[model samples]
Target: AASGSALIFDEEMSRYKLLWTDPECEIEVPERLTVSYEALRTHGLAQRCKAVPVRQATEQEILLAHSEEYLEAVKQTPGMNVEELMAFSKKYNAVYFHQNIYHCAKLAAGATLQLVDSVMKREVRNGMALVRPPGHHSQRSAANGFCVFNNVAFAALYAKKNYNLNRILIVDWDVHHGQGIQYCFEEDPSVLYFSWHRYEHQSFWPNLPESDYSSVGKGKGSGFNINLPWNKVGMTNSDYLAAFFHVLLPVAYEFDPELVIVSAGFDSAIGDPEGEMCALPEIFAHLTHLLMPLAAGKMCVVLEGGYNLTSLGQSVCQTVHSLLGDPTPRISGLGTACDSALESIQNVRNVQSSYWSSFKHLAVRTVVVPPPGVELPKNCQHSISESTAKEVQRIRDKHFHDDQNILRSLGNIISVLDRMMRSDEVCNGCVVVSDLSVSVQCALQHALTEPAERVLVVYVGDGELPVKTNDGKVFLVQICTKETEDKCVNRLTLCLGESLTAGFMQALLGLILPVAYEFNPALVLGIVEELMRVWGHMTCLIQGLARGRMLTLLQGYDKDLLELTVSALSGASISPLGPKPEDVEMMEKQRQRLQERWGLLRCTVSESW
Candidate 1:
């Protein structure tokens, strides 16, 4: 695997200031680059990175996403007088022209390509390039949205042609629509572009009707280009993540790109006047971690639109922090998707299900009857490794009290785990345990035996949490029968008291999944005491995490429950979660209770907690 992270920033990119006094272009200032880079430098992040230099992009490189006429015309800007420059600026939307603008723009485009080259060459695992004349909204024959060249778009096209690669993903997390990139790749299926910009019904800048969720790319690129138009302002961190989980991720994982480039605009961050959103800088940390697993960590985060110097600087630091492989800060207050967010996501799924298999399950959302059949291939190699079995037996002996019934069950589980640890065809695990609650401690000890390993334990039972969450290694989320206060960051207790309805889906999707993804644990340990939570369509959804290392232990061990758990863990398309969540009231209470600590649980922009 590639090791170091690349950092690209040349003081020359910030050499040019906004030459004119235009409100729109003024926010795209030289201070934007310096402040963010300086923040990294002050915190020692810049010093830790594999510093890469920037250069001028050749005419050939610029032409990959722009037209010859536009490129030729931009080249003539340096010699132009103020009057001519103003005339040129007038030709574009929300863009300005200065003698140094063209010079800075090329380097901005060049810096992005340089980072791409570094990551693709195995010189770096991933990187973030801080450049000016922010690109993304620039089109083939036009420059718009304070952009000169489509930096990310050009990088995508450049990689495809230069590296002999096919699938490439461009995620424009900027607050505004990257229509330029959309237009460039709208007809090409090889490139998948995703953007969640402030649409407000075409009421925002560069507002094109095509920016709506309805624009699922043209022709062959129908499902390739995903446009998630924000219908309202003040979208929370939960809102952005919902788009990734429910929209971008499912499809991104399916597309499985060779490389990923981010049109990383920070205007969407909190405190930015343009974004007017309530999300925190920490949200970017979670977002960055979520995408790192894809493309084998080949990601390029290029600076785009971000103003409010304070907000921009903090957001940049948060993003680069994750690129450096730091643990993401846990964020809470996440609940069910908002009314508007759900509408937009469902709309995108409705239009995109015809294109991607990930969305196929959403075509018929409510699944009442689950597919019943347990076909655990017993013929596969089930021999547990000698050392592995020895360790496992030792742990079981300590807890199971030498009960043959439990020992036999433990052997079956260890077999499944051994197969999964081999990363063989059998990817997930499920087993029944007699000493129900003791399974949590066993799983916890098994996970902690490896000094560097981490595990996410999802418990649903009337078990006492014998161990407090002092260690950072085990993150526990339990669905409890009793309501409890004083929950900590490493451990969460949700009291839906005897809640067996499908409303549990909200907890699984909105809370547990987001936290689970950010946790990035080595293993997911599911310990259930009985039927309600275990057989309640939970394991099916939980199987999506830690593919080869998911271990589910059931307190009530039986044939029917085994079939359901196996069906879920054996990689079947998720069973329907019965009826949609009713009485979301319980979930709302839990979300509000934990939202501030868990960022992904946030769903609303209402001012106070």
Candidate 2:
């Protein structure tokens, strides 16, 4: 299950540097890739990731997103001298050329494509390619904004053509508009483009009127294109999140993409002169975590632009941390979004409301821990920094005088999850705890001690439940793959037979998420190690409720399953459900029987199978 995350950083991409003094193009430097990769290595993140070799993108591959005429012009750069290189760069906007720029651009786009290939083949679950000569602002005929090949645009088209993927989501979080990517897919309905950029009233770089909120898309792709233009500078953690919670997440889920591509530009992070926003590096972790559950974790984060060395390096580390399933630093003191950001999110939602059902008709909606004393990769809690891990050890040693037999039964249950639950993370829980029955009762009772008005319990396993589910504030969903049980609104049971990935996901995306949204509990206390036997499908989407304050109570003996749950809870990426095997025929029957009683589960007869 742990296919591993791929890291593609060919130091060769850093070979080409601007030959002449052009102040505008100076910020797009080789150190952009150097510092990011170095930061990952320094953080020990690089060692844990699966390393993939990079090669130059083929001419045929380059031609996939660029024209032959543009290709001809680009090839002339290798043969040009210093003065001629400067002359060539003058024609292109914000693009300076070196003898090796064309070769580096080829590798940049190819690195992105390499990441796509690895992810599609499962060589790696997800990957981040630290490529330079950032792409996104480059156009069909001209290289603009220090971009030559349009890596973001090229990768999507290459993925569609090569893999035959129908629906792909491209999210551009760069501070500047990726007009090139927008221009490429603006008319293609299958690809959904979502970009939130620094469009300070058309005063930013590549300042186009089309970057405004109203520029939905050109034709059939209309409303498929989503743009949240940041009108004000100094946009903070709150503003970036407001854009996702309101604009991206709802529509992205409805789109149900097969793959996700991030035009990940850290210039949007704090202190970058280009972005000038106050968002911290950790914000990328939460953003990445939110996007992780979608596309079934088939995500490719391609480097775009980031100027400030300090913030850029930290931002890259945070994004990689999330990809590797490391426990992310909690988003604290998150304030309200500025009026300008709110206006942008609302306008974008209003503009696309007619198309997206989640937004159609003016609708609604809407970490911690430690172990060990080492400088290992922060792949999970145990590999945390020495100082932080020691502090954690101290905290744990102080809290409990000794470990319980029940605790001994639990795998890796420590001060981490307690802090996560206390801090209000989405979903976190211990695995293989001694006697899940007693553990469930104890956990449920303790949760009640809090001001939790209601707690939704989801248990997937054998035998009848340990605790009485039909109570004033507790709701239970008992899932058994082979046999029997339940009928109250407070209790739900589905006898979906073992080993149907597609079947389970249909119920999950189509039913569970909707049900929890309507049920609206204070905490989603999920008990799921048993489901891991049949494949823990529901847990992927069940974290949607209770403000992400959910916990899974797992019973484990399989050490592999133990680590899987740990990775999942600590924020590691998950793979896509197997291609539609249609094993959910029984689930279909169950949904039909229950939708009437569970109103949110209701659907149009047209969708009825």
Candidate 3:
């Protein structure tokens, strides 16, 4: 139960320097590690964290992700002379080998595994490893993109095999696509892989067509893989946050990973020659802060691609500072996603909507015909509605400031709810409103116009029920965590916690799902937040299995939980917010049973959904 941080690094990792002359490979020098780790020390961040030692990964350990042939080939590099090494480098794209790279790669991969053990075993809440010969782009059979062996990939496989972790999240924020890791787990459901890379319409390096958002993984792994292709460079903090809010956070929370592995690459930060991005070092603090709450705080970050020493050092310090439980610094200019960034977000959502239930609601179609009796409004009336909509959008955009910082990452609430209410883009969706009474009244008014079996009003948390009907047109289910004897007939109460246990999960998928499905609700309206944690986890599965369209009305609640719920329901990669150590242990105990009910629970090398 120690809430401490761990640092994994060694001077040996610095031995793998680019001895040859290659512009693509030279940028990835040993100083990347030295400067990164040194920043942690110089800033006193390292002193705060427990120093974890690094050991050389055995041949068998390296074989977890890489083929024996590749391992043997890398081993021979240390014995080869300069001429022979240069010839070997030409085989794999952008890879350079040194007389000592073989040794350095082993230590690099080993350092990652060592850090993983420390966090998983609870020696530290979270940790990072400063490694060279950055992994992520390295494939099973060959070295590519300046990586000799995939450190993060190997660590994932090692954790699955040894620790028996069912769910693991690998987030590659590096500017370039980690296509090698993507290929390894493309069809594996257990590992939810998400990456946002510098892809200018497939013009970037390692630019396979699969790197686009359209890939979404192959076969059973359909929605498990998420790729946010950056069609333009100079992406800022707003752009990065937009992706997390709209795409990554949603899917991540739904996956509900037990472990989070960040391919901590700083090349995406401002001033990097490769990334050409505009995000400052402070951005890493926010990124780290967002992931810190998930997996009961079990996160492992390994160095990936970062070239600019100044930005790299600052970015590394920012990440380490957050990992050590420091406050996240203020990030400026987070107005909204840029135009190109917005386009990419919409594209990925469109392609992924069919696979994810949360997104299924987002595939809004244009209304060609008005409701049976309703006629099209006059030009003036139509113009007024459009103008009103714009005004509403503007006000809602400014609402979150009076709101909180956590909800800022949840993106523009007004726009999302507006689309859900006005268009067919979403079958149904939720909106967090400050004025509960007004929002609910408006929602009820909208429901009256819809033709359906009946309107199902599901309320969670404590709130006043002003709109009640006895004619069976509106059915209400009120749930709370506290005592309430004068509750509605269909009321259900459950206690709250940092994490939901298997029994609770069972009640959700088992009990709640059946009721909602059997009711055959036309328009489902929800109120409250904490209970949405339960509701959020089941959103995608219910949409896919039970075929329900839920439109939740969120009121005042913890902004953190709101972010967590949205991320979970979206089915993007996200860290569960504010998880206690006991919460993870509770889930671990019923891991088998949970997986049995939820087949897409573990990673398989071959086939799964």
Candidate 4:
């Protein structure tokens, strides 16, 4: 059934955004689709693939994974006003409502189903849908997370009904658990759902005790549900690869799925505030490449979560690049897996050893907790600004000298200017007022002497801010749930895609991280939107601060508390991890080491070292 790669997307999906001031729902933006498609287009990646148009899913098609009551309830949304929409959204968790959300949700689910049909009919070898209002967190009876329709779940059931696929594999690689899919197929042997999420002993979101590994499934599907809960933050490339080698790949091949569906959420990549993970964009390529041989190359990738705009774009490109049959780029940090990841992997295999032949004879390996004296590296903190004070002063002096004219224009908007200019902990950063217009105005007053030098304005959320100049002085990159026109020369709009995951971090680290560093702006201003609405507060702040001379602006009800948190994070010793090329060889050896024990991993390719 292998043909070529296909891409599924629709501009109509951008119509979904939070109509009210709900923090839990602002991170899912429409830019997640536009920026990703823009990346593909800019890099000449899109022209190479077959582009497929999106169509709405039929009521019967949706019923494959959802109940009629749930469907009918969601259908009432477009008719509801803003007040009614907000009230109805209260019935769900992390979900926001707008008049057009119902239509967008259907398009998202329909796009996924279309991709599934394309792959099954051999129209394309494998395809991916750049959708909004992600579906994995959605359930048969209700919506959860930012998802509404359970796209992948519906696709799995649709595949069974249309293609008569008895063996279907659903791989959920999002940072958060996809309990919705697990709930749908946990009792059926026909579909196997495997998910690895940031569990932190169930302290994370959705905080369900059932998210643990011990609660695999019930009845015949008892061994079918596999859950690997990440116990710690800062999980690296080595940790992820080890899980694939020892856990997923072994069982996956034995099950011999006729179709593979990936809940491809990139929030687990570096710079993701929520995931606090260290996996890079290139890691996704390797993961996708590894799964290519399955089901005769019949695979479907549905969007889930990835909030950080910069990383989201890059992560999507990397995944699609792999799906296009390109050789995977070299992956680093393949040595030993992290202690936390190792423990989770071993525990899952040991528990499932009773059912899977590969794990039947394997002995359980206990995880070793680091002693009190030993401390893992703090989150990474490298600046994109100039190194010396003189360089910083020179850049600032040159750009800020002509602020008289700009300040006069901005004087009306600069009502609240709280500055912590020279704190010891915050070497080159400051905490400013919570207003976006004032923050942008102050940033302009500080950094725009020449058209050549630009100020990097990073905004998070869907809050309204005063529109300033369209000149090259302010390079605005807005990360929000709403889709708006890309204003001018310097403005860029980004959506969170399907969900918030490590890909957002990768976008931060890869696109935003590097671009800001390269831009070397005289001032780096950040607008933090809906702090509680986002999953990882500390992670987001640290990533923002990476661009030196960073001034973080906030917009929330509790100004003082938000200000203090921002101040503390700016000064804290957060050390985010980057790629370690040296770890690659060691990772290969570990795979070989485990391969001797598990036969399914013994021959991924003809050659074995």
**TM-score for all models, in order of appearance:** 0.68, 0.70, 0.63, 0.61
lDDT of candidate 1 over 60-122, digit per residue (tens) = 999888889999999999899888999999988898888888999999999999999999998
Residue lDDT tens for model 3, 158-269 = 8899999888999999998998889989998888899999999999998799999888988878888889999999998767766765577656656778889999999999
Off by over 4 Å in 4: 361-609
Give residue 151's lDDT in candidate 1 (0 to 100): 91
- Candidate 4 lDDT over 1-609, as tens digits, reads 245678998888987777778767677888888988898888777777788888899999988888999999999888999889988999888888788888998898889988998999988888899888898899998889999999899889999999898999999999999999999998988899999999999999889888998967889998899999999999887677667766786677667788999999988888877788998887787677556656766889999998888888888888888676443454422455666777788788778878774553311000111111222113212221223334334444664452432233223212111121222232233232334554464445544532224566777768656546365555666777666644353555555432243334423322343234333454455666642333232223333222234445554434444434343333321122111222223223333443332222321322337
In model 2, the worst 10-residue window by lDDT is: 362-371
**lDDT tens digits, residue span 385-454, model 2:** 3543454345446643344455432223333334445564324554445467655765665566555667
Model 2 regions more than 4 Å off: 361-441, 444-550, 553-609
Query: lDDT value for candidate 2?
Result: 0.72
> Whose TM-score is higher: candidate 1's or candidate 4's?
1
> Model 3, 349: alpha-carbon shift in Å?
1.3
How much lDDT does each candidate structure score?
0.73, 0.72, 0.68, 0.66
Tell me the spans in candidate 1 whose CA falls farther than 4 Å from its real position: 360-439, 442-512, 515-609
Candidates 3 and 4, the one with greater TM-score: 3
Name the weakest run of 10 consecutive residues (lDDT summed) in model 3: 375-384
Which has the better lDDT: candidate 1, or candidate 3? 1
- Tell how far residue 101 is off in model 1, in angstroms: 1.2
lDDT-best of 1 and 2: 1
